Design an enzyme around this catalytic site. Structure first.
Site, PDB file in Angstrom:
ATOM      1  N   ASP A  95       0.833  -1.193   0.000  1.00 48.99           N
ATOM      2  CA  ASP A  95       0.000   0.000   0.000  1.00 48.99           C
ATOM      3  C   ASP A  95       0.873   1.249   0.000  1.00 48.99           C
ATOM      4  O   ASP A  95       1.807   1.366   0.797  1.00 48.99           O
ATOM      5  CB  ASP A  95      -0.918  -0.014   1.220  1.00 48.99           C
ATOM      6  N   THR A 152      -3.739   4.867  -4.149  1.00 50.30           N
ATOM      7  CA  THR A 152      -2.857   5.746  -3.390  1.00 50.30           C
ATOM      8  C   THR A 152      -1.504   5.918  -4.072  1.00 50.30           C
ATOM      9  O   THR A 152      -0.905   6.995  -4.004  1.00 50.30           O
ATOM     10  CB  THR A 152      -2.674   5.205  -1.976  1.00 50.30           C
ATOM     11  N   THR A 153      -1.001   4.867  -4.719  1.00 49.57           N
ATOM     12  CA  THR A 153       0.257   4.986  -5.450  1.00 49.57           C
ATOM     13  C   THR A 153       0.068   5.764  -6.745  1.00 49.57           C
ATOM     14  O   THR A 153       0.934   6.561  -7.136  1.00 49.57           O
ATOM     15  CB  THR A 153       0.823   3.597  -5.738  1.00 49.57           C
ATOM     16  N   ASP A 182      -8.554  -2.319   1.554  1.00 47.15           N
ATOM     17  CA  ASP A 182      -8.621  -1.722   0.222  1.00 47.15           C
ATOM     18  C   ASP A 182      -9.780  -2.301  -0.582  1.00 47.15           C
ATOM     19  O   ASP A 182     -10.525  -1.561  -1.236  1.00 47.15           O
ATOM     20  CB  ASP A 182      -7.303  -1.938  -0.519  1.00 47.15           C
TER      21      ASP A 182
HETATM   22  N1  LIG Z   1      -5.847  -7.670 -13.696  1.00 46.47           N
HETATM   23  C1  LIG Z   1      -5.309  -6.496 -14.106  1.00 46.47           C
HETATM   24  N2  LIG Z   1      -4.847  -6.342 -15.365  1.00 46.47           N
HETATM   25  C2  LIG Z   1      -4.313  -5.181 -15.784  1.00 46.47           C
HETATM   26  N3  LIG Z   1      -4.190  -4.093 -15.005  1.00 46.47           N
HETATM   27  C3  LIG Z   1      -4.616  -4.110 -13.721  1.00 46.47           C
HETATM   28  C4  LIG Z   1      -5.211  -5.340 -13.188  1.00 46.47           C
HETATM   29  N4  LIG Z   1      -5.535  -5.086 -11.909  1.00 46.47           N
HETATM   30  C5  LIG Z   1      -5.180  -3.804 -11.644  1.00 46.47           C
HETATM   31  N5  LIG Z   1      -4.626  -3.228 -12.724  1.00 46.47           N
HETATM   32  C6  LIG Z   1      -4.127  -1.836 -12.809  1.00 46.47           C
HETATM   33  O1  LIG Z   1      -2.980  -1.647 -11.985  1.00 46.47           O
HETATM   34  C7  LIG Z   1      -2.987  -0.307 -11.498  1.00 46.47           C
HETATM   35  C8  LIG Z   1      -2.306  -0.228 -10.140  1.00 46.47           C
HETATM   36  O2  LIG Z   1      -3.215  -0.534  -9.088  1.00 46.47           O
HETATM   37  P1  LIG Z   1      -2.625  -0.675  -7.600  1.00 46.47           P
HETATM   38  O3  LIG Z   1      -1.268  -0.023  -7.596  1.00 46.47           O
HETATM   39  O4  LIG Z   1      -2.738  -2.108  -7.143  1.00 46.47           O
HETATM   40  O5  LIG Z   1      -3.613   0.243  -6.729  1.00 46.47           O
HETATM   41  P2  LIG Z   1      -3.006   1.280  -5.663  1.00 46.47           P
HETATM   42  O6  LIG Z   1      -2.513   2.418  -6.521  1.00 46.47           O
HETATM   43  O7  LIG Z   1      -4.179   1.619  -4.780  1.00 46.47           O
HETATM   44  O8  LIG Z   1      -1.917   0.506  -4.964  1.00 46.47           O
HETATM   45  C9  LIG Z   1      -4.437   0.138 -11.458  1.00 46.47           C
HETATM   46  O9  LIG Z   1      -4.560   1.436 -12.043  1.00 46.47           O
HETATM   47  C10 LIG Z   1      -5.183  -0.871 -12.305  1.00 46.47           C
HETATM   48  O10 LIG Z   1      -5.807  -0.208 -13.404  1.00 46.47           O
HETATM   49 MG   LIG Z   2      -5.052  -0.366  -5.415  1.00 50.09          MG
END
Ligand SMILES: Nc1ncnc2c1ncn2[C@@H]1O[C@H](COP(=O)(O)OP(=O)(O)O)[C@@H](O)[C@H]1O
Ligand SMILES: [Mg+2]
Ligand SMILES: Nc1ncnc2c1ncn2[C@@H]1O[C@H](COP(=O)(O)OP(=O)(O)O)[C@@H](O)[C@H]1O
Ligand SMILES: [Mg+2]
Ligand SMILES: [Mg+2]
Ligand SMILES: [Mg+2]
Lengths: 536, 52, 300, 154, 63, 364, 77
Positions: free
Chosen positions: A56, A89-90, A393
């Site tokens: 996170d 958040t990232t 989350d």
């Molecule tokens: N199964 C998937 N296939 C492709 N892209 C994905 C998938 N799951 C999430 N993503 C993308 O990865 C990006 C990063 O999300 P993440 O970093 O996990 O959320 P956060 O920023 O809250 O940590 C998101 O913008 C999402 O669009």
């Molecule tokens: Mg996320």
């Protein structure tokens, strides 16, 4: 130093702008590696050996020790995104840093910062409008599958990603359990009412969803039964202890005969209160205050459970779920001291369950309202903590999807579509706002670029193909179905993310854009720094 | 901040003339509330001319 | 008329050296009026100087009445015409009976509640005794708590609180009231009077204004300046001018300035030295030389 | 003078020297007074008020024109002294108290009940003296009949 | 801050290296009167630091 | 920094100033009547103008968070066991006196709460109390059982503001707590700021007397502080307009015209002071030079063009950042009150005169 | 003889040394003239002029002044 005569340092012009951009880029590069399904977690040693393993962004930026104000701005931005949305958040930090870097690049070309700020504001407004008008999918068209897909997307990049097929169902059931309606008929989903308990032991698939509530407490005395079939829960907000007079009351004995009676009443008061409570048929008694040994003996003889030092929020949740009523005191409006059955909550079972040499209270099938609780099992405490963060989350994502019934395709599809649309639309507004909006559109491309880089894949060609797909979708009215084309990180090819089940709440993207734009504007507004020396 | 009075107050200037300028900006803020930056620049320019 | 002209000249000469020489005429009139309002009293503390930042130095003025930097109660009126002042120095704040060895010792909380009601009734009776004087405004030196404040507000009476010893003395001097501490004899206490009481906006701070005062033997001089240093120096210069004017009022004998007195004294010393044999003549000549050196430094 | 509205000049003053503060009496021994009812509270309030009035009346009965105390007094006593045309001074030091007693030919009275006319001092003029622009006041007691003590003011 | 002798719990006596003791009260929270410091001993309506009087706000006995 | 939000804040500031004053009578504005509340979260676009009262305190009740047709009452006494101003003690010598004390305390609290409720009050504000429990557990329970909103720990400094806002007369003894001391209001609700905290807003009032509250919101602390400072500046500008009803052009026009006219005046002051007046005018030329330099234009050419145009006869001509040159500044609606410029000149001149009288520095 | 540390002070000292070497007189006028030129250039820069423009204008004015000096010169035997 010089004619200004201030006791401190001073940086002016391009130097301070470059320093601010460097700080923002440092913060972004700290968390850049933890984005997307091919992201990786991080270890955070806390200077005394304490280990925190997390993905996170908010946790990473909160646990870090930052000193540059322009970087504290981004850390607080991540914390605000966590508080107000709970996801992305990232992404917001990365987008804000990229926006600031491109804005400073424009400024170095003698473009006035006010023009860049105006262009950024216009670009953010137009991006929000375009997202709301073209890139949203109504959840009613999909159903529970939309919630499941959104949850599974949420667990991606987390330690529970592979077990998403199970964790998404668990999250959706937990969220639907706590749903309640208020005045004006708006359905509200009060997350943080789902108590989450961590206990290492069996594998992750052994995590349990409790149809009720789980208390992280035990019975006061070993003599009480540890299981009641038809629980009559009574909630108290006062200690069941020996009665002691307050500060304003003093006991002065002139006739020695009264001392025995006074000392007898000193405990008979509590005995009478406990007898009044028990006489109504209560089986389980939960109180936030303490309980001495004699009261525990009363409850043992009555054959009833008694849990002390219960948390106030836990007691409120128990009262809401079971239909009980919190009583800070036993005092009716007639001036007497009574306790009728109308304040008794009910549950279908209360069990002192054992979980890996630790015991906890399970209140199952509360009446008049359905509650939920989750117990997470992992290899050790670090696994359980990361599970709790990822689960929070996911709960937040499902809450956002259920409240606002619009979702957007994931995998950088929104970023590419916005970049294409904004670089097309920049040709109509202003002359330097053109460059500002073009740089905003380019900065929006950092998300798919980072996703592709994390997968150890060529980012340039993948982003080029995605941009070509979105450009064809925007220029050809007959190919509007290509708006959903996103990134498939497993194979490194563009993929229709709407049919692939990769969704995000629209509020996540909208709030990320707004917050990142405001943070970039705030940092870009600085052109001089005065750092007064510490008085010591 | 862009506010002249706040900028002058926040940084601890040491020369007596700078302190007097800070008080001047504070007084302009009290009486008017705007122009706290212009008044200090005007005073500085007046003293610069006073040099020659 | 000649004495007033002498006061003008003396105030001008005193203010000539100070920073107030920019508006010497205005400040001379200001100081002379402030001193003459004392009606021959030497109480320089009866003249209050209020320094408010902002505004020009020429905006400084002498209020025709009096200005108080205190606050009025919550529910009490903010404006009274034909005020009837009552200046007091009483408790008005949980005034315990002065028998310090006394205490409440009962056997039931009902008795405690009854004693509490008795205390509140005592405060109410005290407020009623105060109101029996037939007043519109009430200035107390000490604090006024919430219960007497509410009673005063329900009575439609201003209750200015925490007006320190200087404040109550100045109010008594300007309105003619008597600083009372007991209210069992309403007919034996004189009440201050003024045409109007209101709140005025000076800079950014709100002050209570007494207008159309009865006696007026107490002045409030408002000083407006560009910096705190300017305000402090103006206050010092006005203090010097007021002190010299009060001394002249006490003793009206005057001598000419601008080095005239030094020249005359030194000429007398030289005349004496010319008739003195020995080195005492040299010492006298050195004395006269210093006396000449004074206006020499003035001209330098 | 204790109250700022008292007259600043007294002629043919009949001074009463007192070493008891003009406050309700207080036993030296550790004492507690118990209030057990509303009637007790009313009685205590009336007792305090009557003590103040009685002490002022006792001072006034001797025919004194000036009261000199050593331990000071509180607001009610001050206003009663002003109200009855009795100029007073408080917190006069012990040596100054005895000097005034010697010069004025008056005795030192430890409590009001023992204050009589024969114990009163006499001074031709008691005045308050200012010292220019210094807000400092100093009381002068002079023109005594046969003052056995003198003071030198430098 | 050097001396913070909490008093009669209705009033608070506080002082520091400033050299002028301040009289505060708990309920109102208003500085009753600042007496123009390391010790703030009270009466064993008056206190000694120089003996001061509440009723007049001035030093009454110096030693 | 709040310039893209000007279309939101400027009408808000104008309305806030005009709400707390009487246009036909007021000669000055007391800015203490416009309270500004800072809440983290959201953006500056979320700023609101609350016509009622906004409290940051938390409602002590649970489940009572929205009251319609409220009857708010201020309490300046304590709802706890009786405690006289004198040193009080209760002496127990018999066992019955124990539960007698308990029952009498319960009866006293119940009587207080019943007296409060009989007046029809449903929202209760309790002033912060030290040395005595303002709100007891029995009092809170009894008030909850009678469906009364309770907000405690109200600061003593906010009593006047609250009374002026919602029209409540404070009550310090239960005897005088009556219906006429209450202040009616359409709604008293505790809203939630999207997980960034809770605010209690009492909107709608029978007698909304000259008081308004502004809620400032932003992404982080720094922009919130700067937004408050800018809103304060706007309120001060409107206050200046209220004080002296005179408007002057901006964009460096007053300084250029002043420099030109002062040079002309100095040319009629033959002697040794003419140089000083010329220096004064050349110093007043500085502000337009800075305005041109910050905009990225050429300072010398822009300043000389503006001076020539002013000498031609037009006085409402100044730096036009939007166009990038010199134009009639009133077309860009860049105006400011005359009081600002007059005060700036007077204060700067007085400070310069004061400084010119100093000729030595002594270290104390 | 001065023990200076600022580089511009060293430049001034070398300017005086140059004037002494070529001429032998006027070693004090050059310093005052350079100080006055830089003092005027200070306010010229404050008014927003590139220093190269200031130097070019100074060179042009110096050329004009030298020509005028040649004009009003007088010859001696
Ligand atoms: N199964 C998937 N296939 C492709 N892209 C994905 C998938 N799951 C999430 N993503 C993308 O990865 C990006 C990063 O999300 P993440 O970093 O996990 O959320 P956060 O920023 O809250 O940590 C998101 O913008 C999402 O669009
Ligand atoms: Mg996320
Ligand atoms: N849109 C504009 N066009 C031209 N000049 C402007 C504009 N807005 C403000 N100014 C000028 O900028 C100057 C500085 O104003 P500002 O920085 O807001 O406060 P302060 O006067 O305290 O510096 C003002 O004198 C005003 O005339
Ligand atoms: Mg401004
Ligand atoms: Mg003098
Ligand atoms: Mg030579």
């Amino acid at each position: 130093e010089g004619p200004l005569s201030v006791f401190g340092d001073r940086s002016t012009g391009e130097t301070i702008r470059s320093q601010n951009v460097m700080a923002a880029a440092s913060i972004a590069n700290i968390v850049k590696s933890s984005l997307g399904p091919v992201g990786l977690d991080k270890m955070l040693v806390d200077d005394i050996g304490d280990v925190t393993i997390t993905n996170d962004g908010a946790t990473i930026l909160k646990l870090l020790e930052v000193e540059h104000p322009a970087a504290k701005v981004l850390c607080e931005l991540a914390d605000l995104q966590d508080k107000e949305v709970g996801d992305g958040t990232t992404s917001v930090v990365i987008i804000a840093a990229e926006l600031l870097k491109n804005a400073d690049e424009l400024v170095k070309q003698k473009i006035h910062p006010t023009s860049v700020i105006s262009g950024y504001r216009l670009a953010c407004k137009e991006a929000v409008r375009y997202i709301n008008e073209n890139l949203i999918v109504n959840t009613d068209e999909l159903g529970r599958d939309c919630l499941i897909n959104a949850a599974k997307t949420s667990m991606s990049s987390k330690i529970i990603g592979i077990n998403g097929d199970f964790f998404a169902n668990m999250v959706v059931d937990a969220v639907l359990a706590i749903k309640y309606t208020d005045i004006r008929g708006q359905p509200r989903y009060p997350v943080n009412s789902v108590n989450i308990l961590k206990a290492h032991g069996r594998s992750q698939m052994e995590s349990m969803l409790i149809s009720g509530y789980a208390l992280n407490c035990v019975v006061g005395s070993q003599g009480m039964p540890k299981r009641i079939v038809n629980a009559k829960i009574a909630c108290l907000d006062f200690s069941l202890q020996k009665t002691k007079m307050k500060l304003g009351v003093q006991v002065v004995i002139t006739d020695p005969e009264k001392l025995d009676q006074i000392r007898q009443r000193e405990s008979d008061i509590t005995k009478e209160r406990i007898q009044k409570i028990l006489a109504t048929g209560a089986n389980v008694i939960l109180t936030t205050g303490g309980i001495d040994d004699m009261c525990l003996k009363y409850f043992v003889e009555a054959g009833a459970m008694a849990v002390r030092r219960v948390l106030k929020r836990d007691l409120k949740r128990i009262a809401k779920a079971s239909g009980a009523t919190i009583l800070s005191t036993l005092a009716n409006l007639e001036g007497e001291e009574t306790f009728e059955a109308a304040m008794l909550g009910q549950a279908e079972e209360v069990v002192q369950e054992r979980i890996c040499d630790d015991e906890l209270i399970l209140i199952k099938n509360t009446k008049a309202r359905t509650s939920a609780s989750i117990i997470l099992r992992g290899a050790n405490d670090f696994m359980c903590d990361e599970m709790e963060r990822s689960l929070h989350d996911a709960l937040c994502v499902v809450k956002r999807v259920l409240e606002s019934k619009s979702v957007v395709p994931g995998g950088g599809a929104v970023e590419a579509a916005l970049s294409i649309y904004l670089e097309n639309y920049a040709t109509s507004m202003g002359s330097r706002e053109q460059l500002a909006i073009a740089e905003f559109a380019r900065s929006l491309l950092v998300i798919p670029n980072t996703l592709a880089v994390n997968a150890a894949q060529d980012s340039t060609d993948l982003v080029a193909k995605l941009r070509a797909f979105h450009n064809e979708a925007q220029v050809n009215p007959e190919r509007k179905n290509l708006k959903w084309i996103g990134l498939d990180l497993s194979n490194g090819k563009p993929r229709d993310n709407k049919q692939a089940g990769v969704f995000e709440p629209t509020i996540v993207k909208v709030k990320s854009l707004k917050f990142a734009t405001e943070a970039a504007i705030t940092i870009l507004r600085i052109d001089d720094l005065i750092k007064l020396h510490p008085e010591s | 901040t862009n506010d002249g009075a706040t900028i002058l107050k926040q940084m601890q200037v040491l020369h007596p003339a700078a302190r007097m300028l800070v008080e001047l900006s504070k007084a302009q803020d009290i009486e008017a509330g705007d122009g706290t930056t212009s008044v200090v620049i005007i005073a500085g320019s007046l003293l610069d001319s006073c040099t020659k | 008329v000649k004495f007033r002209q002498d006061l003008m000249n003396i105030a001008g000469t005193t203010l000539s050296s100070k920073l107030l020489t920019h508006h010497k005429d205005h400040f001379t009139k200001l100081a002379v009026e402030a001193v003459l309002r004392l009606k021959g009293s030497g109480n320089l503390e009866a003249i209050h100087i209020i320094k408010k930042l902002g505004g020009s130095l020429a905006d400084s003025y002498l209020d025709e009445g009096f200005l108080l930097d205190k606050k009025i109660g919550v529910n009490q009126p903010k404006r009274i015409e034909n005020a009837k002042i009552l200046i007091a120095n009483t408790g008005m704040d949980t005034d315990k009976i002065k028998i310090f060895g006394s205490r409440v010792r009962v056997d039931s909380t009902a008795k405690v509640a009854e004693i509490e009601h008795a205390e509140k009734e005592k405060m109410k009776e005290k407020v009623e005794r105060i109101l029996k004087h037939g007043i519109n405004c009430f200035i107390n030196r000490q604090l006024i708590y919430n219960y007497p404040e509410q009673l005063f507000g329900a009575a439609g009476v201003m209750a200015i609180e925490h007006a320190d010893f200087a404040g109550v003395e100045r109010l008594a001097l300007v309105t003619g009231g008597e600083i009372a501490s007991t209210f069992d004899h309403p007919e034996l206490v004189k009440l201050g009077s003024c045409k109007l009481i209101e709140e005025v906006m000076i800079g950014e701070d709100k002050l209570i204004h007494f207008s159309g005062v009865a006696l007026g033997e107490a002045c409030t001089i408002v000083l407006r300046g560009a910096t705190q240093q300017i305000l402090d120096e103006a206050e010092r210069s006005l203090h010097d001018a007021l002190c010299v004017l009060a001394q002249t009022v006490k003793d009206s004998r005057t001598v000419y300035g601008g080095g005239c007195s030094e020249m005359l004294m030194a000429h007398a010393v030289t005349q004496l030295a010319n008739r003195t044999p020995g080195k005492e003549a040299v010492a006298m000549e050195s004395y006269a030389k210093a006396l000449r050196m004074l206006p020499t430094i003035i001209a330098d | 003078f204790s109250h700022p509205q008292m007259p600043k000049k007294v002629e043919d003053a009949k001074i009463a020297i007192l070493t008891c503060p003009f406050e309700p009496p207080k036993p030296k021994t550790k004492h507690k007074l118990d209030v057990t009812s509303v009637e007790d509270y009313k009685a205590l309030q009336k007792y305090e008020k009557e003590k103040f009035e009685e002490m002022i009346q006792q001072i006034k009965e001797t025919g004194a024109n000036l009261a000199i105390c050593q331990w000071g007094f509180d607001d009610e006593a001050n206003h009663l002294l002003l109200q009855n045309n009795l100029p007073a001074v408080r917190w006069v030091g012990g040596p100054e108290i005895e000097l005034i007693a010697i010069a004025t030919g008056g005795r030192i009275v430890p409590r009001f009940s023992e204050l009589t006319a024969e114990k009163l001092g006499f001074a031709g003029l008691v005045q308050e003296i200012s010292f220019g622009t210094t807000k400092d006041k100093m009381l002068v007691i002079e023109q005594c009949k046969n003052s056995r003590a003198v003071t030198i003011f430098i | 801050l050097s001396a913070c002798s909490f008093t009669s719990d209705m009033q608070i006596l506080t002082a520091s290296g400033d050299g002028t003791c301040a009289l505060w009260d708990v309920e109102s929270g208003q500085l009753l009167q600042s007496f123009h410091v390391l010790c703030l001993d009270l009466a064993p309506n008056t206190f000694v630091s120089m003996v001061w009087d509440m009723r007049s706000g001035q030093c009454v006995q110096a030693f | 920094v709040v310039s893209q939000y000007s279309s939101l804040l400027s009408p808000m500031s104008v309305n806030a100033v005009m709400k707390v004053i009487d246009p036909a009578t007021a000669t000055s504005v007391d800015l203490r009547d416009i309270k500004i509340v800072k809440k983290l979260g959201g953006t500056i676009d979320d700023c609101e103008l609350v016509e009622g009262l906004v409290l940051t305190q938390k409602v002590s009740n649970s489940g009572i968070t929205r009251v319609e047709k409220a009857k708010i009452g201020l309490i300046q006494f304590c709802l706890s066991a009786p405690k006289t101003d004198m040193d009080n003690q209760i002496v127990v010598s018999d066992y019955a006196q124990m539960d007698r004390v308990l029952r009498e305390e319960r009866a006293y609290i119940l009587n207080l709460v019943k007296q409060i409720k009989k007046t029809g009050c449903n929202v209760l504000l309790i002033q912060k109390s030290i040395l005595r429990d303002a709100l007891s557990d029995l009092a809170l329970h009894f008030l909850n059982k009678m469906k009364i909103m309770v907000i405690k720990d109200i600061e003593r400094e906010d009593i006047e503001f609250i009374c002026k806002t919602i029209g409540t007369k404070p009550v310090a003894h239960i005897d005088q707590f009556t219906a006429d001391m209450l202040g009616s209001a359409e709604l008293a609700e505790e809203v939630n700021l999207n997980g960034s905290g809770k605010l209690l807003k009492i909107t709608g009032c029978a007698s909304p007397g000259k008081t308004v509250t502004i809620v400032v919101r932003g992404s982080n602390k720094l922009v919130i502080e700067e937004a408050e400072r800018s809103i304060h500046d706007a309120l001060c500008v409107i206050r200046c307009l209220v004080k002296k009803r005179a408007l002057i052009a901006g964009g460096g026009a007053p300084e250029i015209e002043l420099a030109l006219r002062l040079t002309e005046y100095s040319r009629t002051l033959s002697g040794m002071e003419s140089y000083c007046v010329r220096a004064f005018a050349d110093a007043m030329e500085v502000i337009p030079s800075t305005l041109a330099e910050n905009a990225g234009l050429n300072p010398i050419s822009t300043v000389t063009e503006l001076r020539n145009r002013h000498a031609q006869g037009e006085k409402t001509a100044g730096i036009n950042v939007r166009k990038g040159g010199i134009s009639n500044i009133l077309e860009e609606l860049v105006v400011q009150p005359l009081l600002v410029s007059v005060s700036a000149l007077t204060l700067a001149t007085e400070t310069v005169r004061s400084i010119l009288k100093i000729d030595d520095v002594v270290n104390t | 003889m001065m023990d200076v540390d600022h580089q511009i002070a060293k430049l001034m000292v070398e300017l005086s040394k140059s004037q002494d070497d070529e001429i032998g007189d006027g070693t004090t006028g050059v310093v005052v003239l350079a100080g006055a030129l830089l003092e005027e250039a200070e306010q010229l820069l404050d008014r927003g002029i590139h220093p190269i423009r200031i130097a070019d204008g100074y060179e042009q004015a110096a050329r004009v002044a030298i020509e005028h000096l040649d004009k009003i010169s007088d010859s001696v035997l």
